[PDB]
Amino acid sequence: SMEMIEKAPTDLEDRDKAPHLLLLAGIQGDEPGGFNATNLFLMHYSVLKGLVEVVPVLNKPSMLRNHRGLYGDMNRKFAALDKKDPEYPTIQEIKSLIAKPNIDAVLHLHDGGGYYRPVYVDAMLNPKRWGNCFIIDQDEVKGAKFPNLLAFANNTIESINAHLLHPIEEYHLKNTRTAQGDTEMQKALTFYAINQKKSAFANEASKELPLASRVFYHLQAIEGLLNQLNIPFKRDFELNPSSVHALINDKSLWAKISSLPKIPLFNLRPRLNHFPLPHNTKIPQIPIESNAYIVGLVKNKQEVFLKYGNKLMTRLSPFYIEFDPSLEEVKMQIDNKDQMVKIGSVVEVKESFYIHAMDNIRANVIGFSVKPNEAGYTIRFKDFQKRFSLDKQERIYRIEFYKNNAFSGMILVKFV
Ligand SMILES: N[C@H](CCC[C@H](N)C(=O)O)C(=O)O
Ligand code: NA
Ligand SMILES: [Zn+2]
Ligand SMILES: [Zn+2]
Ligand SMILES: [Zn+2]
Numbered sequence: 001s002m003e004m005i006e007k008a009p010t011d012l013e014d015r016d017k018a019p020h021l022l023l024l025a026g027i028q029g030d031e032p033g034g035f036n037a038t039n040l041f042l043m044h045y046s047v048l049k050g051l052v053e054v055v056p057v058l059n060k061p062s063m064l065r066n067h068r069g070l071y072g073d074m075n076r077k078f079a080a081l082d083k084k085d086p087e088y089p090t091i092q093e094i095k096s097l098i099a100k101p102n103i104d105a106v107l108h109l110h111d112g113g114g115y116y117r118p119v120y121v122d123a124m125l126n127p128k129r130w131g132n133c134f135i136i137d138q139d140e141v142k143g144a145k146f147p148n149l150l151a152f153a154n155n156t157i158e159s160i161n162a163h164l165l166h167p168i169e170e171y172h173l174k175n176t177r178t179a180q181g182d183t184e185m186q187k188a189l190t191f192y193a194i195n196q197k198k199s200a201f202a203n204e205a206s207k208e209l210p211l212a213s214r215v216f217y218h219l220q221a222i223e224g225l226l227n228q229l230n231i232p233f234k235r236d237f238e239l240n241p242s243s244v245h246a247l248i249n250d251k252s253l254w255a256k257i258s259s260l261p262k263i264p265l266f267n268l269r270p271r272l273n274h275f276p277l278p279h280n281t282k283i284p285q286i287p288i289e290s291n292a293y294i295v296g297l298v299k300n301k302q303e304v305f306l307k308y309g310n311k312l313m314t315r316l317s318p319f320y321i322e323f324d325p326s327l328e329e330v331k332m333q334i335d336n337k338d339q340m341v342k343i344g345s346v347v348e349v350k351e352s353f354y355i356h357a358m359d360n361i362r363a364n365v366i367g368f369s370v371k372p373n374e375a376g377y378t379i380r381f382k383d384f385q386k387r388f389s390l391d392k393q394e395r396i397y398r399i400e401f402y403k404n405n406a407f408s409g410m411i412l413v414k415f416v
Contacts, residue, residue, distance in 0.1 A: 001060050001284065002090060004097060005042055005293065007052040018050025019145065019229045020102055022198075023222065024094075025055070025109035026294075027075045027189065029062025032310045033205040033214025034109035039294045039309070040215065040247055041222060048232040053103065056293040058094065059087075061284075064298040066310045076184065078192040098193050104145045105199040107225055108189050109218050112204040116172055124208070131206025132171050134160070134221060137178040137190055143197040150175075152228045153201060159224030165213060165241060169206070201225060212245040219244070255306060255313075256289040257297070259323060261346050261412045265295070267392045268306075268314040276400065276407045277304065279320040324406035330363075331356040332411075333378075343401070343409035348416045354378045355399065361408055366398040381415045 008015055023041065025034030038056035057063050062070045071086045078095070081088055098106055112130025120126040134157050139150040146152065153173055160171045178185040178194075185191055193200035203221035205214035219239055226233055237243045254262040258278055277286060283297050283304055294309045297316075304316040329340045333354040334347060341347055355363050355375040362373040367388030370377075386394040395415045401408040 002055055002058055002093065003293075005054045005056065007042065007045065007047040007054060009048055009050075014049045015051050018231050019104045020051040020053070021226065021229060021231060022097060022103045022106045023052055023054045023109075024058055024106065024189070025218075026057030026063055027059050027108070028069060028073075028110070029057075029059050029065065029067045030310065031068075031109075031111035031207075032211055033111040033207075033209070033218055035063060035294050036211060036248055036309055037109055037215045037218030037222065039292055040219065040244070042293050043291065044236050044247060046234045048234065050229070050231040051102070052226075052231065052233075053097065055094070055097065058090075060296065063294065063309065064296050064305075064307050075189055076187040078189055079187040094189070095192060098189070098198060099196040103198060105225070105229060106190065106193040106201065107222065108200070108202040109221075110202060110204045111207050111214055113207050115168060115206050115208065116174055116204070118172060118174075130204045131208060132169055132217065133174040133204050134171055135174045135176065135190070135202040135204065137176055137185065137194050137200065139175065141194050141197060141199060144199050146199045146229070149199055149201070152199065152225065155228050156201070156221060156224035159227065160217065160220040163220055163239075165216070169209070169213075169217070171217075174204075210241075212241045212248060215248065216241050216244050253292050253308070254290060255295050256344075257306075258287055259325065259344050260410050261344050263390060263412070264396075265290070265292070265306075265308050265313050268390060269392060270312075271303075271315045271317060272390060273317045274319045275304075275316040276321055276323075276410065277316070277318040278323045319407075321405070321407040324403050324408050327361065327401060327403070327408040330358070330361075330401065330411065341411055343411060346396075346412040346414055349381075349413050350416060352378055352380045353413060360403055362402045362404065364400045364402065366400060368397075371402075371404065 025038040035057040038054055042054055059074050077091050114124040114129030115131040116129050116133040117125045134153050136149045136153050140147045157171045176182045176185045178191045190200035190202050205217045251266055253265040256262045283299050296307050298305050304318050306313040327343055329342050332341045335351045357375040363375045364372050365374040367384040390396040397413050399411045
C-alpha cells in the first residue's frame with residue numbers, strides 16, 4: 001500500500017536532461033521527520049530537469065499505528081528473506097524501484113535517537129547513536145554514474161551545516177563500511193542499492209528534535225544532495241523551521257473519504273459520531289484522497305482513526321451502511337438563490353439555506369431538529385446545536401441523505 005509519486009519537469013523531454021533520484025522515507029512508522037519531509041517535498045517543490053521519484057512512506061501500516069514496524073524492522077529485509085514474510089512483496093517493490101535503470105541515486109530518510117558523534121561523549125552523544133548524521137555504506141561505488149559517495153556526502157553535510165539551528169545539531173559523516181562486516185547494515189536498503197551500482201545515502205534527523213526541526217534538516221539534506229546531483233528545483237516557501245511548522249499544520253489540508261465531501265484535516269472535533277462508512281468494506285480498502293500524501297484510516301477498537309502521519313486528526317464512530325450512488329445532486333436554496341449542489345460538495349452559506357424535498361429521499365441536517373426529514377426548512381446558523389459541528393470553530397455541518405435503508409450521500413454547509 002506504499003505508492004511512488006513522480007516529481008518531474010512539465011516537459012517530458014526534460015526528464016533525461018539531469019540525474020534521477022529515488023527519495024524514500026517511513027521504513028519505520030515512528031520516524032515522522034522522514035515521511036513529513038517527503039510529504040512536504042511532494043506538496044511544495046518542483047523538479048525542473050531530471051527526475052525525483054518519491055515513496056513518501058515505505059511502511060504505511062506501521063505509520064498508521066505509530067509503530068516502528070508491525071512486521072519487524074523492514075530495513076533488515078533486503079538480504080535474506082522468507083517468501084512468507086508479510087512484507088516480502090513490499091520489499092520486492094522497493095527493490096524494483098531502486099534497481100531500475102532510470103535511477104542514479106537513492107536517499108533514504110530516518111529519524112534516530114540522540115546525536116551521532118564519532119567518539120563517545122555521553123549516553124546521548126556517541127558513536128552508537130544515529131541522530132543528525134549523513135550516512136554512506138562505503139566511500140565509492142565503482143560503476144555508478146556518480147561513484148564518489150564520499151565527496152557527495154561531505155558536500156551535502158557542508159550544505160546542511162551552513163544552516164544549523166543550534167550547534168549541537170551539527171551533522172557528521174557516518175561511513176558504516178558495510179561490506180567489511182556490518183551485518184545489520186548488510187541487510188538494509190542503501191547497501192542493496194550500492195549493489196545495484198546506485199549511489200546511495202541515508203539521512204538521519206535526531207528524535208530529540210521537534211518534528212518541525214527534524215523535517216527542516218531532512219529538507220536541507222534533500223536540497224544538498226539535489227544540488228550535488230545538479231537536479232534543478234524550486235520550492236514555494238522559505239526553508240526555516242517556522243515555515244516548515246506552518247506547512248505541516250496547513251489549514252488547507254483535507255481528506256476525502258469514499259464519496260463523502262472533503263473534510264479539513266485540522267481543527268476537527270476529536271470525535272465524529274454516527275459517521276457513515278461503506279459497509280462490508282475493510283478499512284484499508286475504503287478510498288481516501290488528500291492533498292497530502294501521508295493520510296489514511298485505521299481501525300482502533302470500535303473507532304476508525306483519521307491519521308495524518310502519526311497525528312490523530314479525528315476519531316470516527318462509524319455508521320456502516322450501503323452507499324447508494326444513484327443520487328448525484330440536490331436542489332438547494334443558498335442565501336435565496338436556487339442551485340443544484342453535487343452530492344459530496346461543500347457549500348458556503350452566509351445567511352440561510354433550504355433543501356428541496358425529493359420523493360424517496362430523506363435529508364438529515366445534523367445539528368438541526370424539529371427517520372427525520374428536514375428538507376422543506378429554511379435553516380439559519382442560529383438554528384444549529386453547535387456541538388454537532390464537524391469543526392471546533394462550529395461553522396461546518398453535515399447534511400446526510402437516505403434512500404432507506406441506504407446512504408445516498410453527504411453535503412457539508414460551511415457558515416462564512
Ligand atoms: N539507523 C538506520 C541506518 C540505516 C542507514 C542505511 N544503511 C539505510 O539503509 O537507510 C538503521 O539502523 O537501519
Ligand atoms: Na528519462
Ligand atoms: Zn506550497
Ligand atoms: Zn530508522
Ligand atoms: Zn434543478
